[PDB]
């Protein structure tokens, strides 16, 4: 029923879980994010999503989610659902606009790169793995369906990407909360989980490697493998 | 590629098709959205989503879609996905953040029930109404687990709408786009086609009837039936 008392708000607070090989490609999202901009932040562990306390951080009962506290400091707002968490860090970290769009043509663009990750290929990614891997019995028509919408989605992206000058998904000249979102769907490793031959989308795969060079996108990868494997299995971690 | 003769961009264009029952639960979004605000706009029905000219607007080839003019006139920009244009219209039309949100606070919410639907009851919607219509062959056991999935976010909402003061889903006191992109999912003609008992959900309910005596939510719903069945089937509408 109640907040552990490790669980303080004093600045951002990132939750996630113990990192494992499937638990951390939607958790990673807002922690690129973090990365790039260089937010104060602090990391929580939580050990079961189940547990009613985090319902009421997030009533999906899933990570990631972020307590922070208001531009005041005098309340504590919440994000939750990946894309929520990006679009809340945008809101008050990315003032400038760097990562969230510096204008309406910007931001027009972003957010329909965002919206057919978060409403396509992420849905439907999270239902192929639901069929395939944890539904008690076997639905081959679903999950072969599903597999098929994950090479439209594919498709898509590998459109834009040929696009004369389109470095990135949403904007020509630099990442934006649309790529970050969109890459832990969109790389080799990924694919290779699905029975894809990434190979088959070049320009996917060649923005998926340059998106995966960048150090905040490394450092993001390396901290979220090794949360709860540290001192503090869950809780709040030490800063 | 070469656009139809009558596709001139003067001011918003909401791109949609004729009207049927099915035909309408998301393009009805943006129109509630530019109904409740005024903006002027034109109505573009497609006679085909899979002609080349409308996937270079939305490479998902769905409406809705939309063009507009860029804030200095200069340029022509596009939002798609039902959830991005609405993004779009309130970033554009929505100066007092009536709809979008006047603070970081305000938008945290309107930003976590939005990407809710977006990335949870929408496709899991989708996906129960692409097996129950549009797949060549019936696949009940699929369709039973999305109908169970559905209940999942009726309850979250229901949730939501029993806390003190919570009159709509993201704010207290007045709806946003996270209420109008929730809304045709959740209404008891909906669950209905579903094979739910909306009453057993009675402030999600309350809630759906309030939305529904909005004079803007009624002026769309009456529009989008019509779109396609009047002098003009596919094109730009007149009037
Ligand atoms: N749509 C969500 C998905 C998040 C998600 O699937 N998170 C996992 C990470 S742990 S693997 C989770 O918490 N799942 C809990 C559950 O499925 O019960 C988002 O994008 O944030
Ligand atoms: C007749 O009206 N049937 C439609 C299906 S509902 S017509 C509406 C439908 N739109 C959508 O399903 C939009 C989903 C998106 N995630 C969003 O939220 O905007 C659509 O355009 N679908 C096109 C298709 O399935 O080929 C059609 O396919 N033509």
């Given at each position: 029923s109640e907040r552990p008392?490790?669980?303080?708000?004093n600045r951002l607070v990132l939750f996630v879980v113990k990192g494992t090989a499937t638990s951390t490609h939607n958790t990673v999202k807002p922690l690129i994010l973090l990365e790039e901009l260089g937010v104060p932040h602090d990391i929580y562990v939580v050990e079961?999503?189940?547990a009613p306390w985090f319902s009421e951080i997030n009533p999906h009962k899933m990570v990631p989610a972020i307590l922070d506290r208001s531009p005041d400091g005098r309340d504590t707002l919440r994000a939750w659902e990946s894309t929520s968490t990006l679009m809340y860090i945008a809101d008050a970290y990315d003032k400038d606009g760097t990562?969230?769009?510096?204008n309406v043509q910007e931001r027009s663009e972003i957010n329909n790169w965002l919206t057919l990750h978060t409403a396509a290929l992420g849905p439907t990614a999270g239902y192929w793995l639901y069929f395939y891997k944890l539904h008690p019995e076997k639905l081959p028509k679903t999950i072969e369906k599903l597999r098929s919408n994950i090479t439209v989605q594919y498709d898509i992206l590998e459109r834009r990407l040929n696009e004369p000058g389109q470095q990135y998904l949403a904007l020509k000249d630099r990442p934006t909360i649309a790529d970050i979102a969109t890459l832990p769907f969109a790389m080799k490793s990924t694919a290779e989980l699905f029975?894809?031959?990434?190979?088959?989308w070049p320009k996917l795969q060649e923005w998926s490697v340059r998106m995966g060079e960048r150090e905040a996108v490394k450092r993001a990868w390396q901290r979220v493998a090794g949360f709860g494997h540290g001192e503090k299995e869950y809780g709040m971690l030490e800063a």
């Open positions: 008392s490790d669980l303080v708000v079961k999503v189940s990562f969230g769009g510096r029975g894809l031959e990434f190979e088959k």
